[PDB]
């Protein structure tokens, strides 16, 4: 692993791990926006106005 020929593989692994982290974040935030943000349109007027 401490070889001078494996730097670009480590950069691609870093990009892949950051991509799957950002995709898990987008997945869970979209799950929150499909689970409970449908009630935001049907929310009460007091909780919106305050």
């Amino acid at each position: 692993p401490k070889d001078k020929r494996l730097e670009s593989l480590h950069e691609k692994r870093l990009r892949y791990l950051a991509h799957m982290q950002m995709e898990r974040q987008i997945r869970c935030v979209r799950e929150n926006a499909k689970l409970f943000d449908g009630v935001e349109n049907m929310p009460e007027a007091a909780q919106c106005r305050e």
Binding site: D3, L6, L9, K12, R13, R15, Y16, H19
Partner: peptide
């Protein structure tokens, strides 16, 4: 630039390292 494919560990072999050295 917003897509990153999974790179396998089998590119870290010695015959895979001599092919790209």
């Amino acid at each position: 630039s917003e897509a990153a494919p999974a790179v396998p560990f089998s590119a870290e072999l010695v015959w895979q390292g001599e092919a790209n050295d």
